[PDB]
Amino acid sequence: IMLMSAIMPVTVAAAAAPPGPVGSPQAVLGFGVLTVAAALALRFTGRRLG
Amino acid sequence: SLWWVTDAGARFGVEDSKEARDALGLTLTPSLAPWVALRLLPQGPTLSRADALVEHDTLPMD
Amino acid sequence: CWWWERTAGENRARVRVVSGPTIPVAATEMNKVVSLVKADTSGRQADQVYFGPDHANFVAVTSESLWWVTDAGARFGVEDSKEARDALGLTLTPSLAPWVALRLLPQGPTLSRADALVEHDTLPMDMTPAELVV
Amino acid sequence: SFISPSGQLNESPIIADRDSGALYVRVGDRLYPALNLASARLITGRPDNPHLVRSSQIATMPRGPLVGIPGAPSSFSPKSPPASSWLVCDTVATQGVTVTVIDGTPDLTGHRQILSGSDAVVLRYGGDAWVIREGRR
Amino acid sequence: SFISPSGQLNESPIIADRDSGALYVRVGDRLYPALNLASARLITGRPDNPHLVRSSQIATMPRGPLVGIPGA
Amino acid sequence: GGMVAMVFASGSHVFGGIGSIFPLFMMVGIMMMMFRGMGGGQQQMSRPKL
Amino acid sequence: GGMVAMVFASGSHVFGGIGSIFPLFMMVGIMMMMFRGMGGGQQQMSRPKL
Amino acid sequence: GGMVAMVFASGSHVFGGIGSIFPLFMMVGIMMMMFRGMGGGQQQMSRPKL
Amino acid sequence: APLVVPQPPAPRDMVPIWVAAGGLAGALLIGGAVFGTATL
Amino acid sequence: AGMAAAAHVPHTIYSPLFRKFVEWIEYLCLMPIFPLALWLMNVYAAIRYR
Secondary structure, eight states: OOOHHEEEEEHHHHEEEEEEEOOOOOHHHHHHHHHHHHHHHHHHOOOOOO | EEEOTTTTOOOOOOOHHHHHHHHHTTOSSOHHHHHHHHTTBBBOOOOOOOHHSSSEEOOOOO | OOOEETTOOOOOOOOEEEEEEOOOOOOTGGGGGGOOOOOOOOSSSSSEEEOOOTSSSSEEOOOOOEEETTSOOEEEEESSSHHHHHHOOOOOEEEEOOOHHHHSSSSSBBOOOOHOBBSSSSSSOSOOOOEEOO | OSEEEEEEEESSSEEETTTTTOEEEEETTTEEBBHHEEEEEEHHOOOOOEEEEEEHHTTTTTTOOOOOOOTTTOOOOOOOOOSSEEEEEEEEEOOOOOEEEEESSOOOOTTOOOTTTTOOOEEETEEEEEETTTTTT | OOOOOOOOOOOOEEETTTTOOOEEEHHHTTTEEBHHHHHHHHHHOOOOOOEEEOHHHHHTTTOOOOSOOOTT | OOHHHHHHTTTTTOSSSSTTHHHHHHHHHHHHHHHHHHHOOOOOOOTTTO | HHHHHHHHTTTTTTTTTGHHHHHHHHHOOOHHHHHTSSSEEETTOOOOOO | HHHHHHHHHTTTTOOOOTTHHHHHHHHHHHHHHHHHOOOOOOOOOOOOOO | OOOOOOOOOOOOOSSHHHHHHHHHHHHHHHHHHHHHHTOO | HHHHHHHHHOOOOOHHHHHHHHHHHHHHHHTTHHHHHHHHTTHHHHTTTT
């Protein structure tokens, strides 16, 4: 539960980094880091596969 | 008299002669119009076979 | 005929004189000389123009000035600025030509962006035109 | 190559450069660049439309100076409606007016209405005041 | 598309009528008939060639008076 | 088909009726000659049976 | 050959010179199928099985 | 062929398209009967085998 | 008479695009390294 | 990428459907050479405009 909860703050932190009004460029790296974080946690934890 | 009205708003006159009518492709019956309304559009040069048989080096710009 | 000849980068052109029974064009091409209208009756303008093989369209003259010559024999001035060049194309470097010859072709208005930006309902008529004979 | 060879030129007297869109007209054996389609028809005498030709062919034919009427119309499409309708309109600002000419059937929807019956309107011209009704001033 | 060619409007600003050859130039949301290719390039700022467009398409957009340098 | 088309573009238009009978009959001959070569036998070991 | 003769009598003269390459290759292509080709039912042996 | 040719000499020229379909299809029927006539096979005697 | 051209539109900002493109470059390279090294 | 492929390929298993796929890449590469070389030499344009 603790590990899973940590991915959200890390994700929005990266998504908000680009300057100016929010739009297309925020989504590119926002969902990117979310993709890598989940895939990475899965291999080394080996649990909660679903 | 016969006239042609372009999409851009200008009006051009057509000489009523068999050769001018057929060259442009206006062998057809024209629609009526009143002078009070038609006179308000700007008038261009006249269309006639004699006027077009001329050569120019370059055009002026008054 | 007076002849001017030059190779790119040479400091000076070669000037020569030629004579013969007919203008120096092959008999196979003799039939495509252009005959100008010549509205200027003074001796300052040519009667005919011919464009041979390997002719030049975009030309510069001796501070330098740029001119564009049409196949119909008319010359137009072109602005030196980036806007005018970039819009028409003409990015390549122009060929050289001598003013004593180039001035013989009739002149049109210069192609400047600043004067193209105009509207008209009707255009002015051309005085002193010439007959087209069939 | 057999279905469409290179030598088939002179199919019609009005030709256009397939690449540059330029318009040319043929007289005798020469090609003259024309100012517009209207003057190309009148010079030739045929009610045709330009035929597209490959730019490599037109460079082999002798030139000539420009020809035609400058600024003449560039497209023709005769039309005949069932009835002819024209309107002259005046609209006043709020000390200033603009004049509009309408050709065709008007749109009478909304509050627009014919000035029939006892309806009227009053306007000024040349110092005098004029009352409009029954289609007269 | 090969049997009976046609065309459609795109981003390009210099267009011509598929069957009448007339030259038009777009300025904002409005089409202006242009006197020649030279002034059309000069006005728009793009060194390019005219794009052939279906004649029934050109009729739907608004117009304006003639533009350019005569005889260029 | 190319040989036939090439003749029409020349304007001879000799085909139609009397003429068309030659290419019409000739077309059948090719199909028989290639069909005859494939009709050499009948047995199957197709994926659905294997 | 009849088609070529029929067009030549008609006067098209389109097949003269290089134009003749169409009738020529067809005649050769027919020749390969009729004389060589492949064996029938009584000739089960062939390069792929031998 | 004789029956067909005699009509052209009279100038009625009724054949072509609509009309030609009868003689065209009728010709196939004759070939189809001679084929059944040469029926059978597999005897395989021949001068080169003897 | 003179022609009224429309005012030209301002060009889009390149800084947000470059950091966003750099963001994926960074994230994928970082994630790949921990995956690859663990194979050893 | 070449060194990466050289180091990992000798110690992994690949199913027949993939091994059969790399074989066909060779043939797909050989086929376009002649059609492309003649295009680069401008031969097709030379012939179409004889």
